[PDB]
Design a binder for this molecule. Structure first.
Ligand SMILES: Cc1ncc(COP(=O)(O)O)c(C=O)c1O
Ligand SMILES: Cc1ncc(COP(=O)(O)O)c(C=O)c1O
Ligand code: NA
Ligand code: NA
Ligand code: NA
Ligand code: NA
Lengths: 385, 385
């Protein structure tokens, strides 16, 4: 009774988790296909992550950015080496990472002109709730009560090359894009659209920023979605799965975008040894030989079953996604919220999203048998919906 | 070589900490009077905090705000009961907590008028680096490269009743104040100024927001500084020490300010069981019988010694503070940065701040003998500065 009423929740209190399962106070087991909203990349209570956390906790958890710490240095090196090789800034959340990206873009633009501060983002995009990220978020409903927001932002239709082109100008300092939109209902960008974004940013001297907070850290079958697409951004933001459950966020920039100087930006908790230790553990597991290959295989298996379901069930209008980031859209007469609720009642946890969809976001360590259970449960719900 | 160059650091890599001491890779011991910048309230590797973290890590660290979790519920109850009894929203950092406060203020204002969106904050205040909090931050140097920022903010001089009065209007939805400014060099508000702020907010129907991210969680000798002053805000933000090192932030509102509704605001990591477990541990330790009384006694002891130093050393221009949040200002010909560096070379860690000051921010568990060592080290540095 002491929490603000800001969330729409499923009626369950969870106290323990192991792998793909989470349990309530009475021991009832739920198959967790939410991953805490694409966060628990290694599932719950993964032995290596738990051990790393316990080990670091008895050593040092926070020293501040007045000094250096080893986990922070190691994670920065791993992120640079496993991406397009740039510099790293550690934040604590997805919205903070995007705020850093916005600031990097703004300073970059002012290197050329005081008028070069415009930022373009997509309609229905989601980049965060803090005011900078909220302005980038192309969704009026989430902005209205809090206006006026940050000036200089304009929106274009996702995957619409023509619309993005018409809104470009020399005064644009950055273009923000989620390689695969998440909150809007899992909408993959087309390779062509991303390629055009890359070309337009080069033409107008703007920074291409990829927000991989939800689609990053192995969920697509590669470490980052941009690697699947073959389009390299100037700036890349990551969070959620980066820490496998421990709050952490990061921004990676190439040399062109490496414009921040001492005092330009900072954070008290960002880069602390406990969170970075978690990140190092996660990256080492994700990059382990054969791991991402298994993710791709499991993703193909799950997608195959859901696509069959799309043809077989008239209430299922569409299935979209990549790797283990999949969205299922229902016909308008069927409520995605009702479907999610019925799934919950049958011990399957899914995440509602826009466009009347539910998201299947299982941990990357999910078992084939668990994929079978989830699909079976959804089918039974739909057979009575 | 992989981290962005955003910080001015002391040349040391720390890997272990215990109590008021932190150690480098070779085992050299440093007396940590930074508390990781007012974060490590219980010192490093406190047995109870370490045990709580290890215990929770093997159970559940993140489930998302789609569900309820026990540590989150327990911490919300403790924060409400130990303050002015309101509702709680969990963020992950100080800047995120203030962003939530800004959003709460904005929605409150629109309940009365679409023009009621102005927010007042103090010159030299510091509320965070994300764009909303950065606009609240009354420091142009930190804003310039990133403009335009959020519209509707205006600044007044801290502790200047007349200036605050002249900037008030019916279009103001909130007044932001740090009961004791930190980054600017530890500047306590006068009780009279805070009382006038409270009256002006009631007169113009605005929310009084106290940012206790740095002065909160026991550092002043009471749980929160507002309790020392006897002036109650509508909204209170907290972070840093709340988690004793684990990233966490919170916003507490009374009924008047409880205006957020489902979907208005949220966060992926906010309120996770691991961070809230840490917060519960911290609050239980801080509220333990006699704990805060000891903090007040140690604060009085340290302040006494530093005030004597002010009279004795001509290079020391002023000493300000409350509890264990103390700032030492040097004459202009003496560099606060040089003093901090020399302290570091002599194994004492302090935090530089504005107004040519250094901050003494020892853990609340600091020993009297450690206070003696710190003062002795500073005196020796000044005897040769
Ligand atoms: C693409 C994207 N960016 C940013 C965010 C916000 O991340 P956070 O909640 O940690 O601030 C989300 C959350 O869903 C997201 O999907
Ligand atoms: C009063 C105050 N508010 C907010 C902040 C920022 O907190 P964070 O770095 O966790 O975003 C600080 C940091 O020094 C602060 O002193
Ligand atoms: Na169908
Ligand atoms: Na059909
Ligand atoms: Na003096
Ligand atoms: Na003097």
């Amino acid at each position: 009774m002491y929490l603000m009423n800001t969330y729409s929740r499923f009626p369950a209190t969870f106290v323990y988790g192991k792998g793909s399962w989470i349990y309530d106070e009475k021991g009832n087991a739920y198959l967790d296909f939410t991953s805490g909203i694409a966060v628990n990349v290694l599932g719950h209570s993964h032995p290596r992550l738990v051990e790393a956390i316990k080990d670091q906790a008895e050593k040092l958890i926070h020293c501040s950015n007045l000094f250096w710490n080893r986990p922070q240095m190691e994670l920065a090196e791993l992120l640079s080496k496993n991406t397009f090789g740039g510099k790293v800034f550690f934040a604590n959340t997805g919205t903070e990472a995007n705020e850093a990206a916005i600031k990097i873009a703004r300073k970059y633009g002012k290197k050329k002109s005081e008028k070069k501060y415009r930022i373009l983002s997509a309609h229905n995009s989601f980049h965060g709730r803090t005011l900078g990220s909220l302005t980038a978020t192309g969704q009026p409903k989430y902005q209205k009560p809090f206006e006026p927001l940050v000036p200089g932002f304009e929106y274009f239709e996702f995957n619409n090359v023509e619309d993005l082109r018409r809104k470009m100008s020399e005064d644009v300092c950055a273009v923000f894009l989620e390689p695969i939109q998440g909150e809007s209902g899992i909408v993959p960008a087309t390779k062509e659209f991303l390629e055009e974004a890359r070309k337009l940013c080069d033409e107008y001297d703007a920074l291409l920023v990829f927000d991989e907070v939800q689609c990053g850290m192995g969920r697509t079958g590669k470490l980052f979605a941009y690697q699947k697409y073959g389009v390299v951004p100037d700036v890349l933001t990551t969070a959620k799965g980066l820490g496998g459950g421990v709050p952490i966020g990061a921004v990676i920039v190439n040399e062109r975008a490496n414009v921040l100087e001492p005092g330009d930006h900072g954070t008290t908790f960002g880069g602390n040894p406990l969170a970075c230790r978690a990140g190092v553990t996660v990256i080492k597991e994700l990059t382990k030989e054969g791991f991402l290959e298994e993710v791709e295989e499991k993703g193909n298996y799950l997608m195959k079953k859901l696509q069959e379901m799309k043809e077989e069930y008239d209430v299922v209008a569409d299935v979209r996604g990549m790797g283990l980031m999949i969205g299922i859209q229902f016909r308008e007469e069927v409520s995605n919220r009702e479907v999610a609720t019925k799934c919950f009642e049958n011990k399957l946890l899914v995440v509602p999203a826009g466009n009347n969809t539910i998201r299947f976001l299982p941990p990357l360590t999910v078992e084939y048998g668990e994929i079978d259970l989830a699909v079976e449960t959804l089918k039974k719900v739909l057979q009575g919906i």
